[PDB]
Paper text:
An epsilon-class glutathione-S-transferase in An. gambiae, GSTE2, and its orthologue in the dengue and yellow fever vector Aedes aegypti, have been linked to DDT resistance through elevated gene expression. Recombinant protein expression and in vitro assays also support a role for this enzyme in DDT metabolism. Upon review of the crystal structure that was already resolved for GSTE2 from the susceptible Kisumu strain, it appeared that the alleles differed in codons proximal to the putative DDT-binding site, a hydrophobic pocket adjacent to the glutathione (GSH) binding site. Previously, Wang et al. proposed that a hydrophobic pocket in close proximity to the GSH binding site was the site of DDT binding.
Our study focused upon two residue exchanges, I114T and F120L, which are located in the C-terminal section of helix H4 and, thus, have the potential to influence DDT binding. Position 114 is also situated in close proximity to the predicted DDT binding pocket. In this case, a destabilizing polar hydroxyl group is introduced in a hydrophobic core region of the protein in ZAN/U, with the potential for marked effects on protein conformation. To better uNderstand the effect of this substitution in enzyme activation, we elucidated the structure of ZAN/U:GSH using X-ray crystallography. Interestingly, inspection of electron density maps for all GSTE2 enzymes, calculated using PDB_REDO, reveal a disorder of residues F113 and Y133, which are involved in the mutual packing of two H4 helices across the dimer interface, at a spot that is immediately local to the predicted DDT pocket. This suggests that this region, which constitutes the DDT pocket ‘cap’, has high intrinsic dynamics. Our data suggest that mutations can influence catalysis even when not resulting in detectable structural alterations, most likely by affecting the molecular dynamics of this region. The I114T change was predicted as strongly destabilising at 2.85 kcal/mol, while the F120L was classified as neutral at –0.98 kcal/mol. The importance of mutation I114T most likely arises from the creation of an enzyme with increased catalytic activity through predicted increased conformation dynamics and reduced product affinity, facilitating metabolic turnover.
Author numbering:
A (entry chain A): 2 to 220
B (entry chain B): 2 to 221
The structure:
């Protein structure tokens, strides 16, 4: 059977996989898991992922969870070149470091900001969580010593970072005066023909969704 | 020359790498970076890692940052076999999933709790902070369908998870009634001959260090 991705386009790590699929020329059949209606908490999905998160990949019965693991798996198995995820231990390590930076810092602090508005119905953002996001921006800025997060070549680490950054920057302002490297890096990824369709809209929408929910939770 | 690790024994991701080295029979020449005195904010270290975090590996001139990347690098580079990090894409994926669960959920929420006490002079642990850690316990509990976090075999994903869990559980209590899988899993890792030296001491000490700092901060 087909390669299936259990996903939601609003979700940043889901968009990270979609970008990877596009960059690989892979065809992923998408099946929508509506987080908002609690589809991910249903027993049929929990069976696939006990952590009940998306994205989840179904590769002919073989279940793979977590976006970064999925991306690594996809490049390893279906990549016809290792540009997106090098075989060389040193270069691969630099990608892995950036990938874990994304999950450990960028994404984690993004959801530490979003879920209080999204899940707990609050209409504010505590400044300590704001600053934590701001510092993640700074850390990302410092990491971009080359054209891309994991070096001079675009890798899956860029897909993971841009999917999160394009979502959180719509809620916590990412100043161009303080983070010019990030904006230049965003502009490189925007030159990807499939960027806007896959991530552009989704990221802007999630960011707008949070802001919309924030205002709505205030009425 | 041997491998150089810019490290601190109290640090969970540092101990995860040290666990990996011991499992690989590698000798790590440690260079201590005291975060409390801001050694990691020094220009010479920032050059090594612009994110100014530990651990950082120096393999004969080659710099590798971030514990999980380092752990993968060590097994790939010096592993006599791949049991700690499989070459097989599927089993490898299960490990990677666990690794990113640790940094994305386990460690992140621990840092969300610890950092403000250790560095920002705070003395309280808000209940939403506690809640979120508790929720990480449940997620780990539900992930342990096998004896180890990424399957029947012990992998570097267990090293990453235990180093964080053994630190956070001393602060935010892990109740045995709700998490029997975690406790059994912890007992398995404690059977490793190098566990207490490499992680069992450091993990307990960090949790104790947080509580001590929390007490001292509260006393103005
Ligand atoms: N590190 C994981 C995080 C995935 C994740 O947290 N997804 C969110 C959507 S952005 C989710 O499924 N939330 C539902 C839940 O945690 O219960 C990955 O990249 O796959
Ligand atoms: N995902 C990273 C996290 C590393 C990390 O956050 N280390 C802490 C010590 S527990 C640190 O260096 N903090 C200093 C800082 O962030 O400025 C890894 O596992 O290497």
């Amino acid at each position: 059977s087909n390669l299936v991705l259990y996903t939601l386009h609003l979700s940043p790590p889901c968009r990270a996989v979609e970008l990877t699929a596009k960059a690989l020329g892979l065809e992923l059949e998408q099946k929508t898991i509506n987080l908002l209606t609690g589809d991910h908490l249903k027993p049929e999905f929990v069976k696939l992922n006990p952590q009940h998160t998306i994205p989840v990949l179904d590769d002919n019965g073989t279940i793979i969870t977590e976006s970064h693991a999925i991306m690594i798996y996809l490049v390893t198995k279906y990549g016809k070149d290792d540009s997106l995820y090098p075989k060389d231990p040193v270069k691969q390590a630099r990608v892995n470091s950036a990938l874990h930076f994304e999950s450990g810092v960028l994404f984690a602090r993004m959801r530490f900001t979003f879920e209080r508005i999204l899940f707990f119905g609050k209409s504010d953002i505590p400044e300590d969580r704001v600053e934590y996001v701001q510092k993640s921006y700074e850390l990302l800025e410092d990491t971009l010593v080359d054209d891309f997060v994991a070096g001079p070549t675009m890798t899956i680490a860029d897909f993971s970072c841009i999917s999160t950054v394009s979502s959180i920057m719509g809620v916590v302002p990412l100043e161009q005066s303080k983070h010019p490297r990030i904006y230049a890096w965003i502009d490189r990824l925007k030159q990807l023909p499939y960027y806007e369709e896959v991530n552009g809209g989704g990221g802007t929408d999630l960011g707008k969704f949070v802001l919309a929910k924030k205002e709505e939770n205030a009425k």
